[PDB]
Structures are given as structure tokens and as C-alpha cells.
């Protein structure tokens, strides 16, 4: 839960999961970029954020 | 093992300490340990079972960390924690059961189940913390080749053996001289019987000797000695050595004479007790030598004088008893005893899931066969399963 | 219960850890727990004891908190803490005694004394902390109806019973076939005696059977089985079932034949042991069936042959024994055992203050009466008083 | 004693908790306590041994502190800690042994070895921390003059004594009335025998009494009372009181009548049970009075009537037996029991190093002599050595 | 179970309350609960099982919420609600049927079907609301370790049993003294019969005793006690205990004498009624002891005096009878009774789908065999299935 993560300030679990490439779902109202470029997908930029 | 023990101890501490209303300062270190366990376990897949009727179970960890409060835990916190705790306890029980039902002639001390083998990886060493129980402490010491110690109340050190030796006999079994004994668990009951009451024996003394070779060295042993053997003081009909015939025993009990208990280690006398009854201490031994004597009483009242004629037939056979009871001892190896449940737990788990007989332990985990042939490989496997059984007992 | 246990646990930790010269970092968490206890209890009146000879005691709490500025504990700090601890220990002793001498038919698991009832309120739940003792742990598991477990060395699972059954008998009592048993505590001694030595039996086999029904299920039970029964192996003069006359028993012991131990649960075989002596494991059972045969030995030396004639009179009666000792077991209900003191403590408190007989327990806490009729209401009351007795034993003992 | 215990407890906690991979949060308080122990002990010289064959050993403490900055403990940290732990464990073991082998008459509670007396100095109290064990807790209560309590499973309260008293006797020992008993450990078997089966007794009833005095008061005692004495239910030939002759005993067992067990404190009846067998509770007592009766069966079958004639000779002797087994009790004094090991440890150390007999304890630490003459001075010395033995058992 | 009950209660309320023309305020809370149920169930797949002939069924939830903004419900609203209600009712009925046909020995109180285990997940706890029925209230109280009781009109506490005991008998069966009894359901009919009419009995009184040990404790029991047993008041030809022959019973009914009905708990008398007939109250008991006496009438008119001769042959056999009917009672455990349909519902569902016999219940859910061996595992399974049957009864 992104709201809980913002409130606690404790980023240990999220940091450990991101460092170790552990599949996860971040839940919360998020702004998103609409990318229409195939090259952006081939560059795998959605994984860089 | 240390890691499995640490998981189990963390879960036990969480169950005991994460209680509604408690100060967060009571649980802070425990919460940190628990969250570290969650971090280390999350994302790892485990498989338990697939032996006998133990079902195959798959374990996945995708849990959140336990939160923090200002002052005291509330009911919400406890329920949230208890969900995670319950899943972890299920997992640990299943891992322990998977390890308890497996054995190996080679490397019987090493983990045998897949989940414990995975738990021995470096990544899980973070979980490891206070290893304070007797079994885990001895496990760590034995890994380091340091002197181990297990304290047993009434150790099951003697395999069951109800036998007799005849030193003087003949096909009619009417003038018999010999010894009969029960070695069972932590008790020795021996009795030397002379049918002639040592009428012809030199000095009117018949010497009886019994030797029990303990399969492991006992130390710091409290032993009760009692003059009589209540098990061999009533009349009985006993099979012949080859079973061909039965003979008759009609004990009349006399005080054992020149009682001498020797506790020996590697063939050397360590402790000696002459005509001492009650509590004695055997500090370090692997052999018990009980020497006693039937001394014909030089004076007899007419009732007594009648029972022991100069010659056959002998109807009242003079028996001298001896009872030895190891109340508590210390052994460098693991043993069954009257106060623990490790053997019973392992046997229960093996019987409940119909574990087929393996190449290490006797069928049914029968203690008599196991202790009779207590090989080092058996000792390693049995220490492993006993440690796992204790780890399981922390939670189940 | 959890609050009373937490009070006692805090007091015991304070007695063990608030010691002269110790690093404050050794006791910081304990100091916080002790201060939380003091804060919660301050300003509360309690009354304990208005039953039997237990006196009415009134308890008032107005204590200062222990300091937190020291780096090491000095003598004065320890003495002031000890003063507070002594008052609290006296109070907890009295609350435990007051709860132990009371029973209820309806909610025997619930508190009965007024002080523990007050301690059940929400304001006191702050005191609650580490519940690690086996009895309080089982208590919390039982509250949530999770699988409990009590480990008993030599459980007192058998009520005392010394009796005999006669299958063949007649008024002279000289050709008797039957069984005699002592079931006491954790031990079953049984013996089948045939006076004719199965001379006229069908193939010279006399089958004996003994059924013991436990009032609670036992799990993970280590049991010693020894072939002989020393209790029924010497001459005896025994009353008749009606008590009119007395008969004679002159036994001669033969090894029992085809010994079969059966451990059963709900009338279903769980463990079977055949010709196995020494240590055995009964994993889960509520009934023991011991079946064993007297086999007339086909070949006898002249003394043995003289013992057992072809017909009456029979002077030497063929007896086969069995001894069964539960060394350790696990039960989901509380039980008296050889190592603990819960029953003895409850009985001692009840006798010390002349607690009148109540509607739950036997006329004086006799364990035979209790275990014979171990009903659920009795189980609830007994678990309550035993948990209280353990809490008291943490401090008083 | 509290300082020695705290040293041992710190060392045991360090052994169990300073392990590879553990969070520093798990050990931070322990690390502070350990460093405080190093600081307090540094620059201090000790000498142990010099009694019997216990070798003189010199101890010097100049150690570095453990680090505090790690997030998780690594192998280097554990080895660094383990070197110091090994030296300290050796020192504590030697101090415990040096104290266990010494005794004093006037002030036997106080420390006897020079090292422990030095450790009783004020400056060493900084080491002192959690005193949670039963023996150290009772030690601190006794030092504060509070009520003490030791739980014993099968307390060894009764010194070994197998004796008989004849209330009716003749030189031919054929019409004998009396009783025989074994008191041993936590067991009391008694048996009253009438050779005439109370034919000439006023109401055909023979009353038997047995008083046993416990050398210490027992409280909260769970006892099992059984109506037969297997120890005195088989035929035996028994010496005479002077030892000049031997008499014959041919028991036939009748159930005891009007069984009355009284548990007394200072001659006052605390507990009383009539015709009650199985488990009974003696709440507080120092004496056990067993009264039972042989009641001649008014109606007999022909075999029973043949056993007991009107006049002599008497070949079948009527016997009624009682068995009293203390399974658990509480005593304000230290006692040997079946589950603990303090007595065995003290005796083992006194034997391995050939400690000369001192002016307090009987030779060889024999328990029967100690408990028969359990004087206050002996109790003080025994509590000291038992506390030391427990502290030693924490590490060795 | 609480969630399944909440689903059923929501559906029952929706059926009863969502009706044309009704004010929305009458149903507003119910509509909120219904929408909460829809939200919690949406997006979840369920499978109700294929055990026996019960077909495998798959359930999907993608329902919209019911409106909230009308002043009065209209026909469109009712039709829209009914569409969703029908599906939810079908799903709940299938879950109840799947749970009713399953049993477990280790944990019979826990849910057995996959759907009910899924519904016990925390994600469904939002559905839970008013638990007001007796069975669900008992369920919650029992999960809370709280004293709760089921009220039974004519509880079926007695296993069916029609038997007799002959205390005096002979191969010709013509001078018989004994008892005949039927224990059936909530009814006991007992009768003591003496053929000699106590002509040769001490004081001319024959005593009869009948003990019925209830398998569960009953409380606040209203009982009718009538002084005769019409079941054993007419001529009968009765098999013998082995069935080898048939004997003849020719009752003549006399008033039972010294009628004493005891209701006992743990062997102690709780209630006692002497010569009282009509309504009595047994407040708390597990056993019923009926003592009664056939008293020979001291004076007899010639017609009466003929029926009872001084010796055989005896043609008119004097019988005294009692009848005990439990009208109402309370039990901790669940029981069949004359009013409730839980047993009938469970048995019907098990019969319709050819559910094999499991390891818990007897074949066919036969109540006599079930109540005879009412084990704790049977009790747990039976309370579970009875609660599920009541929940199903709310809708089906
Ligand atoms: Cl024991
Ligand atoms: Zn032979
Ligand atoms: Zn024991
Ligand atoms: Zn008889
Ligand atoms: Zn004499
Ligand atoms: Zn018949």
C-alpha cells in the first residue's frame, strides 16, 4: 500500500524487494505516463521508474 | 538447524509476547527480529513432504512487516500479527515433520529435507538468533567438536533384557546356582540364586557377579542401590535356555553379602561402593560391575535350619537380590528418558504418516533395537531428529 | 488471568533483575513494564478473601514510579523497588489464593474472585505482557480454542482401583480363573491367574483380557511394558466380591504368552505391540487393551510337573503378569503428575483455610474422585485453579 | 555468589546469542553487559585450586571490548568474542570447582575460596545482572532472610534404613509379632507381621504403628499411598537384632485394616487420611505416622482356614503392608532429588580431585550420613556448594 | 460459519423485506448490508464440490449494487433484487450442502468444504453481521469459550434400547424376578416384575433399581414422572438373553413402592424426588437413578388373594412400573429433538446425494448409533453440520 509506505517512512521491505527484483504490486492512486512509442517498450523504460 | 530453531523461537516469542495491551517496548527487539525474518523469507518458495503419507505442501511468503505503535499493542495489531504467525507456525511444523521422517547412513547429522537444506543457505543466516535451548546448544557445540551434555532424568540407557545364567545346572534343574537379571531402561534388577545355599561352597560363600556394558558413557549419575530384587523374590516357572523344558524357582531371600558396586570407564575402576545402599554417585563410567555374595548364615533358628538341608532335595532356594536405579545422569549423546518426549514425538510422526523403514533406524523406532546397536551414524541421525523434535515442540 | 499472570511475571522479573550494580540497560524494558504496572494499579482498591478462613484483605495502591536516570542500579534504588515489589507480591499471592478456593458450575473457566474480575477490566489490560509459561500459554490457546498441550511426567491418569474379576469360581475358591489389577496413577499392574494351570483348557491356553478406559486422551506417550506384575506374585488372602468369605492365592509366575498391548482411540486401533517389552510409544489413545495368555509349558522338569497336577487340589496357581507405566505423555487437559505441584498447591490452600465443599470439586479435592468423574465443568474449574496455582508458584514458591 | 552467577549467566547468554548472522539488535544489551564484565574484571588477578589434587591456576584479565557498530554479526565477530568467552568460562569453571570442594563450620554460607571472596567485593557488583535461576533466586532470598522454596521431584528426604522392630519375640523366633520397614529416598515401605494372625489378640485385631521423622519440613507434597508392601511380601531369612541367629519370614498378605496416615508438624496433626489410597496431599509436615491393622478374617475358605491354625506351629505369617511414595514436594532447604544433578556434581568434583574429608560433610559426600545428621552448618555449606554446582552447570 | 450465516441472513432479510411499495427506510440498513455482501463477493470464483452425487458447481460474482435513492420500492426494484438474490441463494444452499456432507476426525468443528474455507478468509469478514439465531449464537459463544446451551423440547438423549435384566431366573422361566425397560428418545419406561410377588422376600418387599447414564449433561430439565409403565403392562412372549427359548410374561400391575428418582451429576445426588409424580425439575444431571419397590399388599380381597399363591405355579406376575418423560431440557452439546429439523435435514441431504460413510458418523446418520458413541470428534462434526443445516433452513 503506497499510502501506508508514505506514512510510515519505512522503505525496508520495498527497497529489499526492488533490489532483489521480487515481484510486487504497488497499490494506490498514481499518475502515469502514456507512452505510445514501440521503441520505448523495446528499451524497457517502464522498468526504469 | 540453527535457522529452523531461530524461526521457531521467533514464532514462540511472537505468540507469547505480542499480546493485546502490552507495551511496544516489551516487543521492540522481537518485532525487529520478526520483520527481519519476514524480509528474509518473503519471495522464497518451499516444498515439504512427499515421503510416506506426509502430504506435499507448498509454502509461499508474501507478508507485510509488523507495524509499530506509540505505547501499547491493541487487538487489531494482535490479529494482524497472528495471521502471519499462524502461517509461519504451520510452515515450521511441516518442515520439522519432513526432517523427522528422514534418515541417512552417510551424513546423518546433515539436513535431509529439501526445505531445511534450503534454509541452510547463507541468505537465511540473518534469521539466526538466540540459541539457548539444551538441544540447540548441544547441536552448536557438537558442530564445533566441543563437549556436549544432555541431562536425563531416568535415562533409557539399558535395552530391555530379561535373562539368566546358570553356573551350576543339570537336566533335572533341582540344584541350580546362577544369576537372573532384568536390565530395562534405567533399572537393573539382578538376583543370584543358590539352591544348595552354599552348603558345599568354600567358606560357605557363593560369589555372584553381574556386568552391564552401557552403550554410552554416563557422567554425574545419581544411582539408588537397594539390597533386594523384588522382581526375583517370588516363585516362578522359567523356560530352559533352549526352550526344551521349564524349571522351577522358589526363592527365599537373604541379605546380599559383601555388596560391591564398581563403576568402570574403559576397563578402569572409577567409583567403588562397598556395602553402601541408598543414593550413590557415579561420576563417569561406561560399565557397571555388581559383585555380591550369598553367605550361608552360620546360625539358624529351627524354622530357618529346616529350609536349608545338608543335601538334596532343596525346596527353598537361597536368593540374594540387588536393585540399581539411575535416577538422573548426563550423557554426551542423546537418549530417551522418562521426562522428555523427543523419541515419542519422532515415533508418533513416523507412525502417523506410515513412514517406511529406512537404512538407519530400526522399524517403528523401537528403542531397544536402537540402543542395542547405537552406532555413530544412528547417533547422528537420532540427535538430528531429536533436535528437530524439540524445535517442533516449541510450537506444537 | 493474563493480567494476573503478567503482574506475577513482572514481579518475578523485577526480583530477579533489579539487583545492585546492574546496568540500567539490563532492566530498561523491565522498568517500563514495572512503571506501567504501577500506573495502572495506582488509585484502585481491591478486596481478597471472604471464604472459609481466608481473611478479608484490602489493598490500596499509591506508589511512585521507579527512576530511570541511573546508569547502574545502586542499593537505595533496589531497596525502594523491593518495598514496592513486596507489597505487590503479597497482593498477587492473596488474589491467587482467593481465586484458587472458588469454583463455579456455570463458567468455571471465568474468574470467580472479585479481584480477578476487576483485573479483567479493560483498564488493566495494559499490564499484559510476555505470556511464556506453559500454563498461561495453554490458557491463551484454549481461550481461542487452539489445540492445547500439557506435558506430564507420569500423568495421574488412572484413578486408584485395586480389584479382581473371577471368570471361573465356586464357593470353595480352590479352582479359580480370573484377573486382578491395580490401576493407580500412571501405572497398571495386571495379572491373570488360573488355578488349574490350563490343564483342561482348549489347547492349554488361558486367555486374559484387561480394558482400561482413560478419562482423557493421551498423545505422544512413552510407556514401559514389563512382563511381570510384582504386585500379584506373593501369597494373599483376598476378600470375596460380596465380602462374605476370604479365598487364598498362592501364585507361581509364568512368563505371559502372546502379550498384546493395544492403544485405541474412539474404539479404533491406533497402536499395536506384540511381544514387545521395554519402551513403546502410544501416539494418540484413550483406551488400553492388554491381552495375554497363560500357556501351559508342554515340557516340565519334575519340580515343575509336581507344581501343577492333573486335577484338584491345586496348591500352586499359575499366574501371568504385566506392568504398564506411562513415563511421559501429552494431554489436552490439565492433570496431576509426579513432577508438578499444581494439585498439591490447590489442595494445600483449600485445606489451610478450611474451604467448604463446593458444587464442582470432590469433598476435599481427592484426585481419585476428580479423575473418575472428570467432567467438562470440572475440567474448566481445574484448569482455572491450576493456572492460578502456577501463577502463585512463580512468586510464593 | 551473585557475581559468580552473573559471570556465568553473561557467558551463557554470549554463547547462545552471539552467533553468526544475528541482528545486532538481538545482542546489543548483551554486548553492553559483556563489555561491562570485561571492564570490571580487567586488571584483576585470581588464584584458584591448591586443595586436594585440584591444580593451582592463575587468572589474569586484560581483554579488549567487543565491537558495537555491526548491523549483523559476522564470523570474525563471533571468533573474537569466543576467545574471551573461552577464557572466562575456564575461569568460572575453576572458581566453581575451587568453591565446591571447600567447607567451613561456623560460616559455611559465606564464600570459602579466595577468588569468590575477592569477587564478593563491592567493585565487582557491576557485573551483577538477571538472577533468574531457582537456586540463585533462593540464594538471594536467603541472603535477604525471606522464605525460601525448592521444588523436588522425588526428594531424597529419607535416609536409607532397612530395619525391623519385634514386639513379640522368642529365642526360636516362631511366634513373632512386629513390623519391618525400608525408608529410602522418597519411598517408605512398611509391613506389620503377626505369625499367629492375631488369634489371641483381643478383638482379633493387631495394631501396627510406624513413625518416620523427616529431617526437614516438607510442604505441598504430593504422595501416593498404596495398600501393599512388595518389599516385605516374599519369604526371607532375616538376621536377629544382635546378629546372633537368623529367623524365617513367610508372608501371606492380607489387606491392611483401618489405614490411617497422619502428617504431623511439631507433633500437631496437619493432615489425616483414613482408608484413602492413591494420591494424597500433605500440605506441611515433618513427621509421617502410619497406623494400620491386621484384622483376622472372620470367615475363611478351607484353604484360608488351613493357613492360620489355632496354635503353633505357624508356617504362614499374616502380613499387612503400606507403601508411601513422595512424588513431589517443596522444602525450605536444599535436598538431593531424582531430577537434579547438584549433589552428583559436587561429589564428582570432590572425587576427581581427591578432596580430603573436611569438618562439615561426611566422607565421600555420602547422602545417607548427610541427611541423617542434617545440621544447620551442613545445610549452609550444602546450599553454598549446590548453588555453585548449578552455576557451574550453566557452563560446563 | 459466521460468514455463511451472514450471507444466508442477508438473503432471508432481502426476501422478506424487499417487497413492492415498501418505504426505503424500512430496508435501508439491509440494502447497505446487501451491497456490502455484493462488493465483498464480486470477483471471486467458488467451487462447490463433487462429493458423492452432489455435482461440481462453479460460482461467479459480477453483480451490480442495488439502488438506494427511491422513497418506496417499486416492481422494477423488486425484480432487479430478485435476480441477484436467486443466484446468491443457490450459491449459499450449495455451500451448505457441500459442508453438510463432509466430516473430519482431527478437526471436525473447522470448515470442511473449500468454499467455506475460502469464506473464512479475512477478505470476507466484511460480510459478517447480526448473529442472532440460537445455533450461530451458540457457535460464537463456544468459539469464545463461553457457557452456552441449546434448548430442546423432548431431547433425543436416550439411545433406543429395549432390554431386560433377570436377577432371579431358571431354564423354565416361571419364577422370574427382574426388570424390563425401554429407553427411547426422551422417554424411559421401566418395570420391575416379580413372579412370586415377593412372597418369600425380606419384609415382603422386592427392590428394583434402574440407572440411565446420559451421554451428555442436561440442565433445567422439565420431566413428567408417572407411576406406571404401559409398555410392560400386558402379556408378552419374550426371547431369552441368548434367544435360545421364549418365556412368558403375564403382568398384574401394582403401585410401585418407595419410588425414589435421583438425578445425579458426577456421582453426586443433585435432585431427589420421593413419591412425587407429575412435573419435576432436574436442574443439572448426567445420570438418572430410579429406585422402586414391589410391596406385597398386606391385605388382599379374595380375588386379589387368589392371584398370588404361596408357591409355584405363578400365573399372575406382579409388576411395578415407572415412566419418565423429559419434556424440555438444555444441553451444552447439540442433540436431536422432536421440534428441530437439523438431524433430518442433514440426513436427507446425505441420502439424496449418496454420500458414502465417513470416519466420523455411523452409516445413514443413524441417531441411535450416533448418540451411543457420542465422542468429542463426533460432537464437533455434528455441531458443525447442524449449524450449517440451520443456515440452509433459513433459505431452503
Ligand atoms: Cl520418577
Ligand atoms: Zn536349563
Ligand atoms: Zn520421575
Ligand atoms: Zn469369590
Ligand atoms: Zn530376633
Ligand atoms: Zn432367560
UniProtKB/Swiss-Prot annotation, chain C:
UniProt keywords, alphabetically: Calcium, Capsid protein, Intermediate capsid protein, Metal-binding, Ubl conjugation, Virion, Zinc
One Gene Ontology cellular component: viral intermediate capsid
Domain of life of the native organism: Viruses
Residues annotated as binding Zn(2+): 153
Amino-acid positions noted as binding Ca(2+) in the UniProt annotation, renumbered to this chain: 266, 286
GO molecular function terms listed in the Swiss-Prot or TrEMBL record: host cell surface receptor binding; metal ion binding; structural molecule activity
Family in the record: Belongs to the rotavirus VP6 family.
Name the record gives this protein: Intermediate capsid protein VP6
Taxonomic classification: Viruses, Riboviria, Orthornavirae, Duplornaviricota, Resentoviricetes
Amino acid at each position: 500500500n503506497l499510502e501506508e509506505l508514505m506514512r510510515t517512512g519505512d522503505y525496508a521491505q520495498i527497497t529489499n524487494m526492488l533490489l532483489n527484483n521480487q515481484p510486487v504490486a504497488l497499490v494506490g492512486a498514481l499518475p502515469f505516463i502514456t507512452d505510445s512509442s514501440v521503441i520505448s517498450l523495446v528499451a524497457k523504460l517502464d522498468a526504469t521508474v | 538447524m540453527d535457522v529452523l530453531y531461530s524461526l521457531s523461537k521467533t514464532l514462540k516469542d511472537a505468540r507469547d509476547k505480542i499480546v493485546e495491551g502490552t507495551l511496544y517496548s516489551n516487543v521492540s527487539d522481537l518485532i525487529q527480529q520478526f520483520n527481519q525474518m519476514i524480509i528474509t523469507m518473503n519471495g522464497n518458495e518451499f516444498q515439504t513432504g512427499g515421503i510416506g503419507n506426509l502430504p506435499i505442501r507448498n509454502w509461499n511468503f508474501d507478508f507485510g512487516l509488523l507495524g509499530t505503535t506509540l505505547l501499547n499493542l491493541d487487538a487489531n495489531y494482535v490479529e494482524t500479527a497472528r495471521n502471519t504467525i499462524d502461517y509461519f507456525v504451520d510452515f515450521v511444523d511441516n518442515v520439522c515433520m519432513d526432517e523427522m521422517v528422514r534418515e541417512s547412513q552417510r551424513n546423518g547429522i546433515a539436513p535431509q529435507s529439501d526445505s531445511l537444506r534450503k534454509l541452510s543457505g547463507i541468505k537465511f543466516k540473518r534469521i539466526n538468533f538466540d540459541n539457548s535451548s539444551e538441544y540447540i546448544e548441544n547441536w552448536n557445540l557438537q558442530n564445533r567438536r566441543q563437549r556436549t551434555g544432555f541431562t536425563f532424568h531416568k535415562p533409557n540407557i539399558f535395552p530391555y533384557s530379561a535373562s539368566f545364567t546358570l553356573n551350576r545346572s543339570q537336566p533335572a534343574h533341582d540344584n541350580l546356582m546362577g544369576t537372573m537379571w532384568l536390565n530395562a531402561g534405567s533399572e537393573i534388577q539382578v538376583a543370584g540364586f543358590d539352591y544348595s545355599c552354599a552348603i558345599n561352597a568354600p567358606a560357605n560363600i557363593q560369589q555372584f557377579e553381574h556386568i552391564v556394558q552401557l552403550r554410552r558413557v554416563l557422567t554425574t549419575a545419581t544411582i539408588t542401590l537397594l539390597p533386594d530384587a523384588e522382581r526375583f523374590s517370588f516363585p516362578r516357572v522359567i523356560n530352559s535356555a533352549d526352550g526344551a523344558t521349564t524349571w522351577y524357582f522358589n526363592p527365599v531371600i537373604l541379605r546380599p553379602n559383601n555388596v560391591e558396586v564398581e563403576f568402570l570407564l574403559n576397563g578402569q575402576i572409577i567409583n567403588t561402593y562397598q556395602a553402601r545402599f541408598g543414593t550413590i554417585i557415579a561420576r563417569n563410567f561406561d560399565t557397571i560391575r555388581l559383585s555380591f555374595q550369598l553367605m550361608r548364615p552360620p546360625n539358624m533358628t529351627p524354622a530357618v535350619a529346616a529350609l536349608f538341608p545338608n543335601a538334596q532335595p532343596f525346596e527353598h532356594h537361597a536368593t540374594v537380590g540387588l536393585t540399581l536405579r539411575i535416577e538422573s545422569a548426563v550423557c554426551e549423546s542423546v537418549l530417551a528418558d522418562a521426562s522428555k518426549t523427543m523419541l515419542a514425538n519422532v515415533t508418533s510422526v513416523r507412525q502417523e504418516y506410515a513412514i517406511p523403514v529406512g537404512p538407519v533406524f530400526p522399524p517403528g523406532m523401537n528403542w531397544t533395537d536402537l540402543i542395542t546397536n547405537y552406532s555413530p551414524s544412528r547417533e547422528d541421525n537420532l540427535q538430528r531428529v531429536f533436535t528437530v523434535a524439540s524445535i517442533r515442540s516449541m510450537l506444537v
